[PDB]
């Protein structure tokens, strides 16, 4: 169905720990998980075309993509990557990322909609997964 | 033989499927997947007495039991149960679980030490089996 909406975070699991295993220093981890860094996510979906803007109190980023068409974004640790999203099913998109320069962990993400209209986001780096869950405002 | 040691995972199958057949909703499964990252198992075996600590990037749980003596733990989906472990062979133990309160699917688990020195852990609910294989660190 339809991912469009203004989404507010209600659960976050394993995010700081994932940053830790990627080598992010403790000062940056602590700020990444601070109240002031809680992400709001605004999505506008038109068929396979998506605009997703993710904002905290200090940062704002937007991606625009169509399912099945390569685009550029950043990995969960700021390295530029080429991304490609596919539908795993009607309510779930999966994204494979490839670094533009150099080598690093294999990263990906998924976003999916539940029965009850929660948005679940997961991000994976090698063997480590973090999960965020949002509800619509 | 001796189950003692610190065990690192080399493969895993059907974790989320097990939770799914137990009726855990998809939100909770995806949180559980994040909280299950990089599982490590520390075992201290002294004859028939066992201490088993399971650590992931987010959480640590510990059970202490003696083979043939009932103890309390939780099912894989987090429900309190009484458990009783028995030897099924020289190198394999099997645990049957019964809920403290209420009724539910039959759940069990096993742990086996192979001839190649691997530890195989299985957890069963209905006819779904989740399997993890570890080697000694």
Coordinates of C-alpha atoms in Angstrom, one line a residue:
Chain A
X1 CA 0.0 0.0 0.0
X2 CA 0.9 3.6 0.7
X3 CA 4.0 4.8 2.6
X4 CA 3.0 8.5 2.4
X5 CA 2.9 10.4 5.6
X6 CA 4.7 12.2 8.4
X7 CA 6.2 9.5 10.5
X8 CA 7.3 9.8 14.1
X9 CA 9.7 7.4 15.9
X10 CA 8.3 5.1 18.6
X11 CA 11.0 2.3 18.9
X12 CA 14.7 2.1 18.2
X13 CA 16.8 -0.9 18.7
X14 CA 20.6 -1.5 18.4
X15 CA 21.4 1.8 16.7
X16 CA 24.2 3.0 19.0
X17 CA 25.6 -0.5 19.2
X18 CA 25.7 -0.7 15.4
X19 CA 27.6 2.6 15.2
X20 CA 30.0 1.2 17.8
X21 CA 30.9 -1.8 15.8
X22 CA 31.4 0.4 12.8
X23 CA 34.0 2.4 14.7
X24 CA 32.0 5.6 15.4
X25 CA 33.6 7.4 18.4
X26 CA 31.6 7.6 21.6
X27 CA 30.9 11.4 21.5
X28 CA 29.3 11.0 18.0
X29 CA 27.3 7.9 19.1
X30 CA 25.9 9.6 22.1
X31 CA 24.8 12.5 20.1
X32 CA 23.3 10.3 17.4
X33 CA 21.0 8.7 20.0
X34 CA 20.3 11.9 21.9
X35 CA 16.7 13.2 22.1
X36 CA 17.7 16.1 19.8
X37 CA 18.7 13.6 17.1
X38 CA 15.4 11.7 17.0
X39 CA 14.4 11.4 13.3
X40 CA 11.2 12.5 11.8
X41 CA 10.6 11.0 8.4
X42 CA 8.3 12.5 5.8
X43 CA 7.5 10.3 2.8
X44 CA 5.6 11.1 -0.4
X45 CA 5.0 8.0 -2.5
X46 CA 3.5 8.1 -6.0
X47 CA 3.4 4.5 -7.3
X48 CA 7.1 3.4 -7.4
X49 CA 8.4 6.9 -7.0
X50 CA 9.5 8.0 -3.5
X51 CA 10.6 11.2 -1.8
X52 CA 11.8 10.6 1.7
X53 CA 13.0 13.4 3.9
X54 CA 14.6 12.5 7.2
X55 CA 15.1 15.3 9.7
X56 CA 16.5 15.7 13.2
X57 CA 16.8 19.0 15.2
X58 CA 20.3 19.6 13.5
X59 CA 20.3 17.7 10.2
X60 CA 18.0 17.1 7.3
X61 CA 18.5 14.9 4.3
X62 CA 16.3 14.0 1.4
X63 CA 16.4 11.1 -1.1
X64 CA 14.4 10.8 -4.3
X65 CA 14.2 7.4 -6.0
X66 CA 12.1 5.2 -8.1
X67 CA 12.0 1.5 -7.3
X68 CA 14.2 -0.4 -9.7
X69 CA 16.3 2.7 -10.7
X70 CA 19.8 3.3 -9.3
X71 CA 20.4 6.4 -7.2
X72 CA 23.0 7.9 -5.0
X73 CA 22.8 8.3 -1.2
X74 CA 25.1 7.8 1.9
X75 CA 25.7 4.7 4.0
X76 CA 24.7 4.7 7.7
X77 CA 28.1 6.1 8.3
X78 CA 28.3 8.9 5.7
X79 CA 30.1 7.2 2.8
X80 CA 28.6 7.9 -0.7
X81 CA 27.0 4.8 -2.2
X82 CA 25.0 3.7 -5.3
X83 CA 21.7 2.3 -4.1
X84 CA 18.9 0.2 -5.7
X85 CA 15.5 -0.5 -4.2
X86 CA 13.4 -3.5 -5.1
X87 CA 10.0 -4.7 -3.9
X88 CA 10.3 -7.8 -1.8
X89 CA 6.5 -7.7 -1.5
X90 CA 3.6 -5.4 -1.7
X91 CA 4.4 -3.7 1.6
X92 CA 8.2 -4.1 1.8
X93 CA 11.1 -2.5 -0.1
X94 CA 14.7 -3.6 0.2
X95 CA 17.8 -1.6 -0.8
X96 CA 21.2 -2.9 -1.7
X97 CA 24.0 -0.3 -1.5
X98 CA 27.5 -0.3 -3.1
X99 CA 30.3 2.1 -2.1
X100 CA 31.3 4.5 -4.8
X101 CA 34.9 4.6 -3.5
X102 CA 36.8 2.0 -1.5
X103 CA 35.9 -1.0 0.6
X104 CA 33.7 -1.5 3.7
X105 CA 30.9 -3.4 5.3
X106 CA 28.1 -4.7 3.2
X107 CA 25.2 -2.4 3.9
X108 CA 21.5 -2.4 3.1
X109 CA 18.2 -1.2 4.4
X110 CA 14.5 -2.2 4.3
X111 CA 11.3 -0.3 4.9
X112 CA 7.9 -1.9 5.4
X113 CA 4.4 -1.2 6.4
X114 CA 2.5 -3.3 9.0
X115 CA -1.2 -4.2 9.2
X116 CA -1.7 -1.5 11.8
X117 CA 0.2 1.1 9.7
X118 CA 3.5 1.2 11.5
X119 CA 6.6 1.8 9.4
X120 CA 9.5 -0.4 10.2
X121 CA 12.9 0.5 9.0
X122 CA 15.9 -1.8 9.3
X123 CA 19.6 -1.1 8.4
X124 CA 22.2 -3.8 8.2
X125 CA 26.0 -3.6 8.2
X126 CA 27.5 -7.0 7.7
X127 CA 26.1 -9.1 10.6
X128 CA 24.6 -6.2 12.6
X129 CA 21.0 -5.0 12.3
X130 CA 19.3 -2.0 13.7
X131 CA 15.5 -1.5 13.7
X132 CA 13.4 1.7 14.0
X133 CA 9.6 1.8 14.1
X134 CA 7.4 4.8 13.3
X135 CA 3.8 5.7 13.4
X136 CA 1.9 8.4 11.4
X137 CA 1.2 11.8 12.9
Chain B
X1 CA 32.2 -34.1 25.9
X2 CA 32.8 -30.7 27.5
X3 CA 30.4 -27.9 26.4
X4 CA 32.6 -25.3 28.2
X5 CA 33.9 -22.4 26.3
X6 CA 33.0 -19.2 24.4
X7 CA 31.1 -20.0 21.3
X8 CA 30.8 -17.9 18.2
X9 CA 28.1 -18.3 15.6
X10 CA 28.9 -19.5 12.1
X11 CA 25.4 -19.9 10.9
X12 CA 21.8 -19.5 11.8
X13 CA 18.4 -20.4 10.2
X14 CA 14.7 -19.8 10.9
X15 CA 14.9 -17.5 13.8
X16 CA 12.3 -15.1 12.6
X17 CA 10.1 -17.9 11.2
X18 CA 10.0 -19.5 14.7
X19 CA 8.8 -16.3 16.2
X20 CA 6.3 -15.9 13.4
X21 CA 4.6 -19.3 14.0
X22 CA 4.5 -18.5 17.7
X23 CA 2.4 -15.5 16.7
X24 CA 4.9 -12.7 17.4
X25 CA 3.9 -9.7 15.3
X26 CA 6.2 -8.3 12.6
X27 CA 7.2 -5.2 14.6
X28 CA 8.3 -7.3 17.5
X29 CA 10.1 -9.7 15.2
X30 CA 12.1 -7.0 13.6
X31 CA 13.0 -5.6 17.0
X32 CA 14.0 -9.1 18.0
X33 CA 16.2 -9.5 14.9
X34 CA 18.1 -6.3 15.8
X35 CA 18.5 -7.3 19.4
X36 CA 19.8 -10.7 18.3
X37 CA 22.8 -9.3 16.4
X38 CA 26.2 -11.1 16.8
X39 CA 25.0 -13.7 19.4
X40 CA 27.8 -15.3 21.5
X41 CA 27.3 -18.1 24.0
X42 CA 29.4 -18.7 27.0
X43 CA 29.0 -22.0 28.7
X44 CA 30.4 -23.2 32.0
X45 CA 29.7 -27.0 32.4
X46 CA 30.7 -28.9 35.6
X47 CA 29.3 -32.4 35.1
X48 CA 25.5 -32.1 34.9
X49 CA 25.5 -28.4 36.2
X50 CA 25.5 -25.7 33.5
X51 CA 25.8 -22.0 33.3
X52 CA 24.9 -20.6 29.9
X53 CA 25.2 -16.9 29.0
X54 CA 23.9 -15.6 25.7
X55 CA 25.2 -12.2 24.7
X56 CA 24.2 -10.1 21.7
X57 CA 25.1 -6.5 20.9
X58 CA 22.2 -5.4 23.0
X59 CA 21.4 -7.9 25.7
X60 CA 22.7 -10.7 27.9
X61 CA 20.6 -13.5 29.4
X62 CA 21.8 -16.2 31.7
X63 CA 20.4 -19.6 32.8
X64 CA 21.7 -21.9 35.5
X65 CA 20.5 -25.4 35.6
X66 CA 21.3 -29.0 36.5
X67 CA 20.3 -31.8 34.2
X68 CA 17.3 -33.6 35.6
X69 CA 16.2 -30.7 37.8
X70 CA 13.4 -28.3 36.8
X71 CA 14.3 -24.6 36.5
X72 CA 12.5 -21.5 35.4
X73 CA 13.4 -19.5 32.2
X74 CA 11.6 -17.9 29.4
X75 CA 10.4 -19.3 26.0
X76 CA 12.0 -17.9 22.8
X77 CA 9.1 -15.4 22.5
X78 CA 9.5 -14.3 26.1
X79 CA 6.9 -16.2 28.1
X80 CA 7.8 -17.6 31.6
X81 CA 8.2 -21.4 31.6
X82 CA 9.5 -24.3 33.7
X83 CA 12.2 -26.2 31.8
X84 CA 13.8 -29.7 32.4
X85 CA 16.9 -30.8 30.6
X86 CA 17.8 -34.4 29.9
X87 CA 20.6 -36.1 28.1
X88 CA 19.5 -37.6 24.8
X89 CA 23.0 -39.0 24.1
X90 CA 26.6 -38.5 25.3
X91 CA 26.9 -35.2 23.5
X92 CA 23.3 -33.9 23.2
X93 CA 20.9 -32.4 25.7
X94 CA 17.2 -31.8 25.2
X95 CA 15.0 -29.4 27.1
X96 CA 11.2 -29.5 27.3
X97 CA 9.4 -26.4 28.4
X98 CA 6.0 -25.9 30.1
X99 CA 4.3 -22.6 30.6
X100 CA 4.0 -21.3 34.2
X101 CA 0.5 -20.1 33.4
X102 CA -1.8 -20.7 30.5
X103 CA -1.4 -23.0 27.5
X104 CA 0.5 -22.7 24.3
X105 CA 2.4 -24.4 21.5
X106 CA 4.9 -27.0 22.6
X107 CA 8.4 -25.5 22.7
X108 CA 11.7 -27.1 23.3
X109 CA 15.4 -26.7 22.6
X110 CA 18.5 -28.8 22.2
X111 CA 22.2 -28.3 22.4
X112 CA 24.7 -30.8 20.9
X113 CA 28.5 -31.0 20.6
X114 CA 29.5 -32.6 17.3
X115 CA 32.5 -34.7 16.5
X116 CA 34.0 -31.8 14.6
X117 CA 33.8 -29.7 17.9
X118 CA 30.8 -27.6 16.7
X119 CA 27.9 -26.6 19.0
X120 CA 24.5 -27.0 17.4
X121 CA 21.6 -25.3 19.1
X122 CA 18.0 -25.8 18.0
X123 CA 14.7 -24.4 19.2
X124 CA 11.4 -25.9 18.1
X125 CA 7.8 -24.7 18.2
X126 CA 5.1 -26.7 16.5
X127 CA 7.0 -28.0 13.5
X128 CA 9.3 -25.1 12.9
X129 CA 12.9 -25.6 13.9
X130 CA 15.4 -22.7 14.3
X131 CA 19.1 -23.9 14.2
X132 CA 22.3 -22.1 15.2
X133 CA 25.8 -23.5 14.7
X134 CA 28.8 -22.2 16.7
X135 CA 32.5 -23.0 16.9
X136 CA 34.8 -22.5 19.9
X137 CA 36.4 -19.1 20.0

